[PDB]
Amino acid sequence: EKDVVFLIDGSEGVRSGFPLLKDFVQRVVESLDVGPDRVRVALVQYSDRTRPEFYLNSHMDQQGVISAIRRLTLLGGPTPNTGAALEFVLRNILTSSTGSRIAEGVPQLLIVLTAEPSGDDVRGPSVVLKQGGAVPIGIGIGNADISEMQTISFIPDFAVAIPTFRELGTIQQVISERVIQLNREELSSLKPILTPS
């Protein structure tokens, strides 16, 4: 059992790379055992606002999730306010009412993809998410800030920096491997790192 949420920068900085991002998300999902009693998948786009695209309880199989990803259109917007988006996910998407099994101790894995420095502070939100049971993996593309992605990530090791959307496919296996590593037992041995700025 895993709840896997993709939080995707949909600001204008991502417009040209968005089809490659959609491809990447599908590559990860295809590796997961998707179903209500196994892996649940959600996806939220964000810029200076958030837009849930589908929730952990929306689909019950691989076809449903993949079809939903394929149909995404870019949210748009000037900036990625990543900190606000992270808290929005914690408080609204990692919830029992929207299909999260957080209350039962199911891993809450949050894969964040962005291509620019955040338009807001991610430090405080990162603390709140780690204290609240989220396990984030920050994937910074291009101009994304390395420190920010490390800060967001449950521990810095989990963060990834890749120079272009073109290279995003080259990390799909290690992201899949991380999702596998992070079961309830492994997470039991892992503690998050909190040392803001």
Author numbering: 1024 to 1220
Question: What does the published report state?
Answer:
Collagen VI is a ubiquitously expressed extracellular matrix protein that forms a structurally unique network of beaded microfilaments. All collagen VI chains consist of a relatively short triple-helical region as well as of N- and C-terminal globular structures that are largely made up of VWA domains. The collagen VI α3N5 domain structure is the first solved structure of a collagen VWA domain and differs from other VWA domains in having an extended C-terminal region comprising residues N1206–G1224.
The structure has a central six-stranded hydrophobic β sheet flanked on either side by three amphipathic α helices. Like most of the collagen VI VWA domains, the α3N5 domain does not contain a conserved MIDAS motif. Closer examination of the structure in this region shows that the extension is linked to the core domain by a salt bridge formed by residue R1207 from the C-terminal extension and E1024 from the core domain. Furthermore, residues L1210 and L1213 pack into a hydrophobic patch (patch 1; Figure 3, dark blue) formed by the residues P1130, L1132, V1158, and L1205 from the core domain, and a second hydrophobic patch (patch 2; Figure 3, light blue) is created by the side chains F1177, I1178, and P1179 from the core domain, which is buried by P1215 and I1216 from the C-terminal extension. The last two residues of the extension showing unique electron density, residues L1217 and P1219, interact with a hydrophobic ladder created by the long hydrophobic portions of the side chains of residues R1146, V1150, and K1153 of the α4 helix (green).
